[PDB]
Amino acid sequence: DYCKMYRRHVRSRFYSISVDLNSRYTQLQLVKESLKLELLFEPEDGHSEPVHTVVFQGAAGIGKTILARKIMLDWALGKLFKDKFDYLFFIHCREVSLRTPRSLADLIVSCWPDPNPPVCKILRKPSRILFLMDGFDELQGAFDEHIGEVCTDWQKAVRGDILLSSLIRKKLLPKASLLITTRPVALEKLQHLLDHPRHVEILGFSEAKRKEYFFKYFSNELQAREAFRLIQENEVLFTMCFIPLVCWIVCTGLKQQMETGKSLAQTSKTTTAVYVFFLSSLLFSDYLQGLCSLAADGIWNQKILFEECDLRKHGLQKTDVSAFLRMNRFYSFSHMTFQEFFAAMYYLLNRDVKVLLENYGKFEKGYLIFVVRFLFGLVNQERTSYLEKKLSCKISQQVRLELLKWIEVKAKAKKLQWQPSQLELFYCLYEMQEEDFVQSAMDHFPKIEINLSTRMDHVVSSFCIKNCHRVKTLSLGFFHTSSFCRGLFSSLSTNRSLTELDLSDNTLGDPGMRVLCEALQHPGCNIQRLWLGRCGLSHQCCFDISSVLSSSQKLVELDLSDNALGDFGIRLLCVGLKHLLCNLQKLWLVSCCLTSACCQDLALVLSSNHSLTRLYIGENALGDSGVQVLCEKMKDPQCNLQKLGLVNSGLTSICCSALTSVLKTNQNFTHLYLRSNALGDTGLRLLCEGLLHPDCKLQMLELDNCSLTSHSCWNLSTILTHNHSLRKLNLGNNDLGDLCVVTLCEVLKQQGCLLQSLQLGEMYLNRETKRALEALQEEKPELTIVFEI
Amino acid sequence: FHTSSFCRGLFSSLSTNRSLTELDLSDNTLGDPGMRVLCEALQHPGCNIQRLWLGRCGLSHQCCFDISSVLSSSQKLVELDLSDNALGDFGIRLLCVGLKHLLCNLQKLWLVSCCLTSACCQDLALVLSSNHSLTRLYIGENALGDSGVQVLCEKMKDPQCNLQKLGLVNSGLTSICCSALTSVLKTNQNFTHLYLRSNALGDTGLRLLCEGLLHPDCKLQMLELDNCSLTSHSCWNLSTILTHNHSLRKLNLGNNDLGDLCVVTLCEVLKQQGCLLQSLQLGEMYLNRETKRALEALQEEKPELTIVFEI
Ligand SMILES: CC(C)(O)c1coc(S(=O)(=O)NC(=O)Nc2c3c(cc4c2CCC4)C=CC3)c1
């Protein structure tokens, strides 16, 4: 059969990567943004748009190419896509040059062993055909201008980029399958070309998978066990080994060490500089210059399949082929990271460094930063000296100052979208490992925002913020953590500059919140502000937070919105709040799944803590009973509460009498919110009962969506005519009628009203009403209106 | 609520009424012949009506001839409404004859949703150079387009033009007419207000408006941009407008995805005392907690600068 012979041929091609593939292969961890490899293309939901558009993301050396070759070999061995698919094809960006227009026939002929495939027979059922695009970072060189060029003929010879762009949007063989493996850097535009794709990220080895990989690498079990033990000797190296490429490099280095008699613990002692130490252990200035210039010209030209002319220009000769390079004549680097490393080393042995600084972005997915990363690696004073004394060369030093200036350029720029993320900057600053320069070039980050998804991220963040000395606002993202939280927040207590800490929407969980709590109550921490919205906490964290409040006198405000604390959680918090050393001022408790029962406890807080100015207990099933319980204790003039809020509390007019008492008595209760409460006109009249009081101080009174009516409208007129202190108001979603609006207008006309804002959003008024509102805006422009819906 | 005889019998006395000043007839389907009857009722010298609203009356181009005669014969009428009547470009061509008359004292003219096109715009231009009493025009919700707006503006750039509060709500414009609007802002010294909602101006259009907004001779006292389908790329231009325009005192940005960075930059720009803005709206978008804190702060230290950030 044709499929059997083609599968045998691709098995022959993909048997090795030399070194055998499957024997050295080890499983990886992948999660859809764990998704099993055998569970790839079936739709989890029965209404999935074509499953044929799946995109893959991963780091450099994560195993996208190895995953592609492994799935191809499985399809060549009778494992996967036998009863489901029939044909699998391989397309590579490096081989498919964008300058030469081609067709799908060319790709099939290249993939087929026979230069004369049955093209007529194999282009009838695209369902059982899957096209693979590996290394997508070499395709969008002209997608930004070729949006409208569409080709749908399989036999038509059109530029490779245009043809693949046509393939992506499912119009050339629309029912065929596609599998694209990409770097995650520059997907922002590609998702526009994608028709309901599935983004799957690759995370690499776990601990057991790492041990399996060392077993499958070394031919000696004892040597593999010693390598494993020395990997756990260095925690940093063990964390770095989640990338299979680093495992390969360290295994080869340990092989070279033990065969030559060198000790293996030296490899473990070497951190963050695996590539440089590996190169030094493996091993002339003309050779280095030629190879470095070859890598640099490949960088500019996006060329990997070098020919003789490049080596002629760079002075490289036939005797200049080594292990890093590979001859196929075709010259190609074994893995790209090596050529970025050589290009980075070039600029320290066009030599103008500014090409790296500003010509970034000309290549999709940012080849340069990785390059520049090793630049920060090499410019390290100890590493620079070691490079000079190991290769007898000299390293330029103005490059460090230029890179510093680039650091401030990146930090202080405005159009921050095009630049790569700040986590890349922190990777660089961890790579270089120069304390004074890190501190000096890092004092330019008053506000730090980072999103963490692996052990390496946690380690680099720990180092970076530990180096920080002048940071004020800090945010974190645990995008998937007791050990993680400990490792990060241990340094935060020692940080004497931090003042605001954002952790909203992170599912750090309850034990992580506990870890944060014992981190905070250390006397060194200077955090005055802590936001914890939607953290997924519960009543357990309230005990720890209460301890923090009773022990810390620097914290000012605090947020706990949308955590199911409950009335028991509030009961736990009030113990800390009532403590005489609590300096809390603003306390959010929105949507904390509360009930009226907690309200009583809250009352004691208002008579035990005087620093609490504004409370926000909206969106809870408090009710009239709870509001009355709060108000009854709140009527004391000594109570210092200012800006209470009861948004969507399900109240009624019953609590309005208590609110009236509060307004009549308290002299500091300025603001007040009541939206989404069925107060009614009786409730508004009851509020008016206290609003007219000469001792009132209410400086705003929101009533949006209170389900009001025009019966208490005279009360509105009275409030405006007599309240000389109220300066804002809201009436959204209240059917008051045209007569009420015009009476409001005529009341506002006089100079005795000091109102400075009013909203009539979202209702249908009249033409006469609109004229009256325009007039009142005309003669008095200070009194703003938002009447327009 | 169900009229030639009816209209005659009623409006015969209205001409003799020496006290009436405003006459509302919105939503009445009095038809076109009834509107004619009203017209011969009005142009009697005794009538003192200064205000006539005719929204959704179901009129057509036929009534425009009679209304033009009324305008050319009456010197007491001040404003006039014709919203949601299918007048058409021919109806506007008929009206402009009366409007261009030297005895027309019209000040406010609504023409919202009059089924117009760009062709009428040229005629309207002559009005602005023939009638100086016309202060505010409202020609929104029509398929005018960039060509029509350019035709209006090209004649509108004269500093002698007395138009103040033009409006182009939902006119289907684009950034092309923004250069003409920039010229208007650069030249005219009385064009205070201006509406542009529901127009796909874009960030390029906002930059083009900023080109004339920054002019020291500007006088624009409000600039609505709600639902203009904006973005954060021209955001520096927003900062520049607030930092340099000392006359603008209102603004609208509803239904514009500007992003958190833009909102916080807006905040920090507004912080300084060099900004005289007295209102701003950020209705109907999803902001951030830090954004909300910044907005609450700017409301705290300076209470005069109102914000409607809450959706
Ligand atoms: C921000 C984000 C998600 O980490 C990212 C964005 O872009 C990339 S990547 O595609 O540049 N890959 C890499 O940097 N891999 C990589 C890493 C380390 C060490 C090495 C490599 C490559 C060889 C040595 C240590 C952590 C990652 C990653």
Ligand SMILES: Nc1ncnc2c1ncn2[C@@H]1O[C@H](COP(=O)(O)OP(=O)(O)O)[C@@H](O)[C@H]1O
């Ligand atoms: N599944 C795997 N099993 C064993 N080694 C792997 C695996 N994936 C990657 N590697 C290691 O990574 C190297 C190849 O990296 P590659 O897959 O080309 O990275 P990328 O896919 O990011 O280009 C090989 O030397 C190999 O040792």
